[PDB]
Design a protein around this nucleic acid. Structure first.
Lengths: 80, 85, 45
DNA sequence: TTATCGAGCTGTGGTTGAGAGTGAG
DNA sequence: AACTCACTCTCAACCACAGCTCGAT
């Protein structure tokens, strides 16, 4: 529908531990990415809105990442 | 980078996620592209571990939902289950 | 939490080990695929 | 408690058009 | 600065099936 399953599968298979992947796993993953992209984008938007801006900027995404515990794993990705 | 989800697909999804008047910097698109790509890695490693412990070779949909639950993403699990049917 | 920190650290260390080159893991399945009838690239009987 | 085994399932890869990537306006 | 949209050309999806996978037993 939206995200290409092959590229989802390719990221999965970059982990040397994964062996087989079920047919529905990338299907599920593509939906989960849409829920993830939505939440990360809206929380970034919030910060942009709070700073009286309409253009989401990188620091907005960083703000969302710092503030949201679920996004704790990405904290070292923002800064270069 | 060819290790990430395509940025056009990612950008489209952030756009539909926002009020029509919103704008998104090129930098913000690249940052979110990486993040959702890392989301797939993060979850896959936990699913991959579950399969090792339980000595199976196939990562299936339940393994992904277990992994998402123990990594803080229980809120997704409901909608996901409902989406498979 | 203490449990999250373990999984997050493991995720970061697994990072250095991502292998994106096309690795083949069922070398038999290559054989059958490599020598299999194709209509326009697609498999066929 | 651990093991079994057949109904189901999945990796594999040439080809190509659907759609990702691109940039001047 | 980001968005538009027509254009280029990449690359994801498609297929069959031998025999491995895994939960009801």
């Amino acid at each position: 529908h939206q995200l290409p399953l092959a590229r989802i599968k390719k990221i999965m298979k970059a982990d040397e531990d994964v062996r087989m992947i079920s047919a529905e796993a990338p299907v599920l993953f593509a939906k989960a990415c849409e829920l993830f992209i939505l939440e990360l984008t809206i929380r970034s938007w919030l910060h942009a809105e709070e700073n009286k801006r309409r253009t989401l900027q990188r620091n907005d995404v960083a703000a969302a990442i710092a503030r949201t515990d679920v996004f704790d794993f990405l904290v070292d990705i923002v800064p270069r | 980078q060819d290790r990430f989800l395509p940025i056009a697909n990612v950008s489209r999804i952030m756009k539909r996620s926002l009020p029509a008047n919103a704008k998104i910097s090129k930098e913000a698109k690249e940052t979110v592209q990486e993040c959702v790509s890392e989301f797939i890695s993060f979850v896959t490693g936990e699913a991959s571990d579950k399969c090792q412990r339980e000595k199976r070779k196939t990562i299936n949909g339940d393994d992904l939902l277990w992994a998402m639950t123990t990594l803080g993403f229980e809120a997704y699990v409901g909608p996901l289950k409902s989406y498979l049917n | 939490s203490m449990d999250r920190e373990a999984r997050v650290l493991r995720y970061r260390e697994k990072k250095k080990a991502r292998k994106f080159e096309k690795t083949i893991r069922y070398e038999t399945r290559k054989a059958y695929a490599e020598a299999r009838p194709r209509i326009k690239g697609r498999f066929a009987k």
